[PDB]
Amino acid sequence: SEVPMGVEIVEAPAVWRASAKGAGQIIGVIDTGCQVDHPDLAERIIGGVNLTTDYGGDETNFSDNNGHGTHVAGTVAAAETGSGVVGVAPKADLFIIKALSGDGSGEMGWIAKAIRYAVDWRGPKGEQMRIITMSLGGPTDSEELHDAVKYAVSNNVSVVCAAGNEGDGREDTNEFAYPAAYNEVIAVGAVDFDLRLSDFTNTNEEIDIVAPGVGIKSTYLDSGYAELSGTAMAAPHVAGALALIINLAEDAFKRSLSETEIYAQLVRRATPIGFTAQAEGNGFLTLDLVERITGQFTEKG
Amino acid sequence: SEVPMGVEIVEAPAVWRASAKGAGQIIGVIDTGCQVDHPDLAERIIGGVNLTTDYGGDETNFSDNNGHGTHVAGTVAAAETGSGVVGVAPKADLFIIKALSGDGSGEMGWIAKAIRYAVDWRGPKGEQMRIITMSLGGPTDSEELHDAVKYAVSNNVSVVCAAGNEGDGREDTNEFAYPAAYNEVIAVGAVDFDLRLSDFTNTNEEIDIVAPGVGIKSTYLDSGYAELSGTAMAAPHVAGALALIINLAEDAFKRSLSETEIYAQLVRRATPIGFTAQAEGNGFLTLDLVERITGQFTEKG
Ligand SMILES: [Ca+2]
Ligand SMILES: [Ca+2]
Ligand code: NA
Ligand code: NA
Ligand SMILES: [Sr+2]
Numbered sequence: 344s345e346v347p348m349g350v351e352i353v354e355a356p357a358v359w360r361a362s363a364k365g366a367g368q369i370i371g372v373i374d375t376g377c378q379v380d381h382p383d384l385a386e387r388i389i390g391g392v393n394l395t396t397d398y399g400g401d402e403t404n405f406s407d408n409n410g411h412g413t414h415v416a417g418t419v420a421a422a423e424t425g426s427g428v429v430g431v432a433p434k435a436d437l438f439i440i441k442a443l444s445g446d447g448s449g450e451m452g453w454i455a456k457a458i459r460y461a462v463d464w465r466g467p468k469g470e471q472m473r474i475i476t477m478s479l480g481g482p483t484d485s486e487e488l489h490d491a492v493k494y495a496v497s498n499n500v501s502v503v504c505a506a507g508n509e510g511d512g513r514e515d516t517n518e519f520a521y522p523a524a525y526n527e528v529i530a531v532g533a534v535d536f537d538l539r540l541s542d543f544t545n546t547n548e549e550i551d552i553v554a555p556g557v558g559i560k561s562t563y564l565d566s567g568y569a570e571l572s573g574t575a576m577a578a579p580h581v582a583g584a585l586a587l588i589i590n591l592a593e594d595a596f597k598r599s600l601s602e603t604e605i606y607a608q609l610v611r612r613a614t615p616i617g618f619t620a621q622a623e624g625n626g627f628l629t630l631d632l633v634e635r636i637t638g639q640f641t642e643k644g
Numbered sequence: 645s646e647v648p649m650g651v652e653i654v655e656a657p658a659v660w661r662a663s664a665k666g667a668g669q670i671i672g673v674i675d676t677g678c679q680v681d682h683p684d685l686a687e688r689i690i691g692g693v694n695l696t697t698d699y700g701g702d703e704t705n706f707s708d709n710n711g712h713g714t715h716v717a718g719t720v721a722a723a724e725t726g727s728g729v730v731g732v733a734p735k736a737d738l739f740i741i742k743a744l745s746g747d748g749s750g751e752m753g754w755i756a757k758a759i760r761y762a763v764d765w766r767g768p769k770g771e772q773m774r775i776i777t778m779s780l781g782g783p784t785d786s787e788e789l790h791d792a793v794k795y796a797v798s799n800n801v802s803v804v805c806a807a808g809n810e811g812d813g814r815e816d817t818n819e820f821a822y823p824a825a826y827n828e829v830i831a832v833g834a835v836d837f838d839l840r841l842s843d844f845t846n847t848n849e850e851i852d853i854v855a856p857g858v859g860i861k862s863t864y865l866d867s868g869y870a871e872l873s874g875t876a877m878a879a880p881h882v883a884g885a886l887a888l889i890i891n892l893a894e895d896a897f898k899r900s901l902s903e904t905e906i907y908a909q910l911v912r913r914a915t916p917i918g919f920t921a922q923a924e925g926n927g928f929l930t931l932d933l934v935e936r937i938t939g940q941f942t943e944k945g
């Protein structure tokens with residue numbers, strides 16, 4: 344089906360109805376930018392920015408030299424179309440922030456302003472962003488990346504990061520990457536479709552959750568489709584999951600929720616597997632877990 | 645058994661082993677003070693303060709004129725003894741803050757300093773407090789009660805409050821009490837042993853969880869035992885639950901956790917019943933829920 348397996352095990356379809364499919368949420372994608380014209384993405388993308396000196400400092404060209412950030416974006420919100428793929432939140436909107444280059448590398452300061460950009464951003468109506476996603480990592484702790492992050496988190500924005508693919512198969516070796524390594528962030532590691540712990544996934548004391556990250560079919564360059572692998576692919580499932588969660592929990596609680604409140608709601612939709620918390624964090628993302636533990640039986644007409 | 649039913653449905657016994665029974669955590673009880681000599685409490689109480697002008701401004705007499713704060717304290721940590729009752733965290737220590745009078749009333753400013761006291765407190769080693777509990781409510785929002793609360797929460801202290809017993813049986817009438825009504829607090833409503841929604845429990849958009857609050861047998865005055873009722877009795881189960889949760893989650897995550905992190909861990913040990921979130925918040929406190937969803941089978945020798 345139009346739906347990939349990762350969007351499936353994560354249980355997004357079980358909650359689309361109650362979540363309005365992510366409708367009304369704007370997700371910032373910080374990556375190598377995006378193919379704006381891909382049929383599976385064009386009505387999701389409502390804008391973007393270029394902060395690399397790719398295309399020579401060209402502030403408004405945020406298309407994709409790599410293919411990476413096109414992939415990630417599909418996982419977050421590839422729309423339903425009969426065609427290709429659907430993302431965890433096919434009614435959420437994507438703001439593209441190209442802060443990586445065609446070589447897939449970026450300088451700490453490209454990231455930091457990307458974060459700030461998205462927080463400080465507004466669009467026509469005053470439509471602001473609530474989730475940001477970054478399937479990208481750096482071995483280096485520079486403060487003020489930290490600060491951009493803390494800037495975000497305390498203006499009720501949720502920050503979702505790939506954990507890093509610099510690890511072995513020991514839960515007990517711990518390997519870090521930034522910004523996933525900061526506490527304020529939602530740091531996502533990777534498992535495959537058999538919930539086996541992918542080898543490359545960084546383990547540490549700051550991992551929040553894991554999601555599918557092996558052979559993820561999603562939107563590719565030149566209106567294509569490709570299967571990539573990495574914690575870069577895990578991260579966006581939890582990015583989308585958050586648009587669902589905000590909607591369905593703001594319904595239920597009948598008000599706005601804090602960053603804190605959102606995180607708690609994410610975490611209660613996580614199911615431990617058999618790995619340590621340094622490896623799986625709070626568990627694997629199971630978006631229907633709350634319904635399932637509650638088991639009300641309702642009429643059917 | 646020495647164990648009351650509320651400590652039982654809440655599933656405290658299922659996690660005592662892994663939590664060290666609350667060992668190493670100091671819970672502040674803000675109430676009508678406590679019978680320091682009750683056999684079921686004396687080795688739990690490691691100090692206390694009097695901030696009422698009961699016993700004429702007598703700063704160091706924190707015994708109990710009412711019986712209320714003796715009850716609450718038992719629910720939090722009545723120790724195992726073969727005798728009477730056991731609390732949700734029978735190895736946690738209690739600091740008594742009398743800020744209510746023999747008439748069970750207190751002035752907003754007695755509360756506010758009680759909170760501040762406990763935060764700013766230290767004992768011999770530099771043993772500080774992590775949980776505070778307040779089975780007490782006031783119809784009035786005075787800022788700087790708010791601030792005491794925010795003071796607490798941002799110095800990694802968790803604040804646990806009775807929701808209020810000024811409600812009907814409609815989930816949709818919403819009735820408030822302070823400090824339970826502030827967002828930063830963990831506000832607890834009451835259900836009975838059949839998970840029926842007790843009538844008196846305040847409902848609103850700020851309720852976090854519910855726990856047993858009908859006919860709670862606990863430690864009473866003059867080394868007695870009594871069954872009281874109210875959200876005042878719900879609150880302490882979640883107070884104790886937090887000492888368990890901190891211990892077991894700091895084991896698992898192998899570091900210190902923030903206020904945020906603690907709350908998420910509480911909330912994932914809550915099971916919705918069939919009521920709205922205005923009524924049950926995130927659900928009923930089920931301390932073994934995480935194990936149960938994870939279902940690893942381990943050897944037995
Ligand atoms: Ca490792
Ligand atoms: Ca009501
Ligand atoms: Na599609
Ligand atoms: Na006892
Ligand atoms: Sr985190």
Ligand SMILES: [Sr+2]
Nearest residue numbers: 827829830852
């Ligand atoms: Sr709250």
